[PDB]
């Protein structure tokens, strides 16, 4: 790989520089290189990886949605061709993330937090593939996303408090999956409300290191429930 000759510690350092420069493609490449050194990631490093790839795929998703809207309103091959170009790049990034998860990061060992974190990522990037998939392949990608979200939920419900930001973010995203991907708005609503209510009931479990993240995601759950009711 292009990062193979660089020290792991220098890759992490350069990922943090790229974050500060808002150079998220660079940041993702540096963190992919660090992952490939084969050592487990710390919590901080985990979240350098995730923010980098989320920003890359987030921009591709926003571009795809713009072109897709132009395309469906148009009903010359140019809009379809360019939408397909962006779609191919987006699928490539998702396949890169999913391969790193399967090949290096997901394991039968580590924090409960660690396994939930990467399993949530797997559900998310299968969801992004599902947003652009068609026909025979869509409903298979859906099943893959569901099984990763569900394994993550099973672990988080047993090993993490109901205010844990990863547990909350997982449920927020799984709830969106139900609504936008699986056409089950009632499962989406039930999960968001249950997650919010169980966080309130055990609000005493907020952690002084992460309570701002917890309460932020609790509002996002309320936001989606407002949007959906």
């Amino acid at each position: 790989g292009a990062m193979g000759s660089m020290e792991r510690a220098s890759l992490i350092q350069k990922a943090k520089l790229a974050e500060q420069a808002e150079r998220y493609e660079d940041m993702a490449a540096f963190m992919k290189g660090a992952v490939e050194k084969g050592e487990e990631l710390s919590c901080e490093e985990r979240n350098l990886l995730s923010v980098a790839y989320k920003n890359v795929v987030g921009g591709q998703r926003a571009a795809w949605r713009v072109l897709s809207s132009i395309e469906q309103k148009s009903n010359g091959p140019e809009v379809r061709e360019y939408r397909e170009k962006v779609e191919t790049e987006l699928q490539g990034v998702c396949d890169t993330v999913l391969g790193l998860l399967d090949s290096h990061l997901i394991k039968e060992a580590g924090d409960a937090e660690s396994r939930v974190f990467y399993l949530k990522m797997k559900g998310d990037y299968y969801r992004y593939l599902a947003e652009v998939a068609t026909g025979d392949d869509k409903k298979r990608i859906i099943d893959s996303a569901r099984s990763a979200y569900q394994e993550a939920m099973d672990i988080s419900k047993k090993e993490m408090p109901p205010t844990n930001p990863i547990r909350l973010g997982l449920a927020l995203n799984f709830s969106v999956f139900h609504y936008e991907i699986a056409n089950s708005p009632e499962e989406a609503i039930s999960l968001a409300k249950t997650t919010f209510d169980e966080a309130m009931a055990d609000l005493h479990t907020l952690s002084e290191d992460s309570y701002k993240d917890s309460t932020l995601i609790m509002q996002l759950l309320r936001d989606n429930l407002t949007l959906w009711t």
Binding site: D124, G169, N173, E180, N224, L227
Partner: peptide, 5 residues
């Protein structure tokens, strides 16, 4: 769109 993190 709905919120995700």
């Amino acid at each position: 769109f709905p919120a995700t993190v």
